[PDB]
Amino acid sequence: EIMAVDIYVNPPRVDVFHGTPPAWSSFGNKTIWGGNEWVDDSPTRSDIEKRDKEITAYKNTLSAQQKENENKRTEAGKRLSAAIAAREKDENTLKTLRAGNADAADITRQEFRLLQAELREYGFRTEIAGYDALRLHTESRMLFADADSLRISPREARSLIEQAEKRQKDAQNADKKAADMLAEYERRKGILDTRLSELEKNGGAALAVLDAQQARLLGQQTRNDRAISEARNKLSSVTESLNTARNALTRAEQQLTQQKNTPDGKTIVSPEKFPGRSSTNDSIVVSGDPRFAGTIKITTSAVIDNRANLNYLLSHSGLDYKRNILNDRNPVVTEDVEGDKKIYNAEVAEWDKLRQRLLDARNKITSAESAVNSARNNLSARTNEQKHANDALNALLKEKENIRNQLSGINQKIAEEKRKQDELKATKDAINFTTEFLKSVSEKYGAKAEQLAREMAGQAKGKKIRNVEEALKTYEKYRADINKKINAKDRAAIAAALESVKLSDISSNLNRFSRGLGYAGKFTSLADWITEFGKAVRTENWRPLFVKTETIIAGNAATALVALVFSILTGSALGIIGYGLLMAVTGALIDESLVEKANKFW
């Protein structure tokens, strides 16, 4: 809530003692303390007894006034008590709120909260100050009265009076205590008015800080979402290439396998598992020596079946291999020189021709392998990039997570300050609807009217609606008065008028008042209530209407009722007779006192 609202409506009043010194009818209102020094003006026996009667009956009057004057002080005192209960409740809260180092603002509100409570307490303290003044005034009168007696000695006289004067003055001081006191009150309220504006000022100031903070956050958000696009694309342009590579490699390794499976190929891959062989039939012819002259028909074979040897060949000559791995060195192995030389050359040609073969074969796998690895080393090159795209994109997705987080917080923050900022205004303006109410009440029905209205809200606040039967009992007593006065056509008007109420239309006022007066719960059969209220003014039954009231308001608080009646008076005409009858009936459910004042002003 943050506001008090009980203040601003019904601030301390402090009404001074209405006197009227007595002008005794006995013995010429003379008093024995009156000048007599050089005369004889003596009070006869009857003169005295009479004077005694007057003074007696009179004192009694001040006496009754006083007893009832106390009672009021008493209830006040009770309210002072509660007023204090709060001051404490609040104060206590403030301290811990500081023990935790709550936000300057939380505390600023709390302080302002204890302030109003404090003002409240002081409020009642002032009201007490007045009652006491009254008791003093009554007293000095009591004495003054007793100071005329005529049964006393001029001594006792002059003393009784001196006493009275001393007392009346005290009373007068009392008067000045309250008044100053009553001024102070307002002198403090003003500070509240200041203290609240500070609150409102800084309240908006904070709002802004959030409004602008959530601004960067929004301009950030967009930018982030922009960046997201870019990166999301770059990941593509990367992955796009990633495939080209993998495709290249796929085709490459494809090629390698091909070259690795050539019959000769396999031998490069494995001499032993797949020996590389080659042979050629030669029809060598010899001449000269008839012992060998002919045509030798042989078959030159050669085979490679070992890494050791395969390597050597690829790295040497056939002739060499022939001469260094086989150690077939001298071509001449037999008596047939020509043949032996020709055969050898043939034997060697093989190695030469197989070498060329396994050789080329090697190269084929060679070229492929460089291809392969080149592709295999561009794919990787590319994958490094893919990471540095996906990762990069993700990092951004994180800030997305974080901006949204930072923002939501802020959203909430602003909403909250808003609901709080609103309520204040709502309760403020409300506190202004009621003030604006009581006044026009003064303008249409004059003085007595407002004073009643308030005094009704005066009790009410804190007390629950009175028991039905106990309620009717009060009204029935004030029956032939509240109906005596003026109730002719007026009655039929008051009724028909009451009936014609559009709950729908007056609903809002009820909501404003309730707040302005302190009730916030829930009404329930208002459409009916009013209706019953009507029939009630026609048939003077009163019971069901009274019974109904016990059953319309949540906490059964009088405060809501008053708020209700305030609404009905705001959606009709009725007039001074009407205002009366209502306040009167309603009062008989809050407190009998209100009725007296009701029946006493019209």
From Swiss-Prot:
Stored Pfam families: Colicin, Colicin_Ia
Start and end residues of each stretch annotated as Disordered: 254-286
Region (Channel (C)) residue spans: 428-602
Record membrane topology: Multi-pass membrane protein
Keyword Transmembrane: yes
Keyword Transmembrane on entry: yes
InterPro entries on file: Channel_colicin_C (IPR000293), Channel_colicin_C_sf (IPR038283), Channel_colicin_cen (IPR014740), Channel_colicin_N_sf (IPR014739)
GO terms, molecular function: pore-forming activity
Entry keywords, A to Z: Antibiotic, Antimicrobial, Bacteriocin, Cell membrane, Membrane, Plasmid, Transmembrane, Transmembrane helix
GO CC annotation: plasma membrane
Subcellular location(s) per record: Cell membrane
Predominant location: membrane
TM region(s), chain numbering: 558-572, 575-590
Known function: This colicin is a channel-forming colicin. This class of transmembrane toxins depolarize the cytoplasmic membrane, leading to dissipation of cellular energy.
Name of this protein: Colicin-Ia
Species, as recorded: Escherichia coli
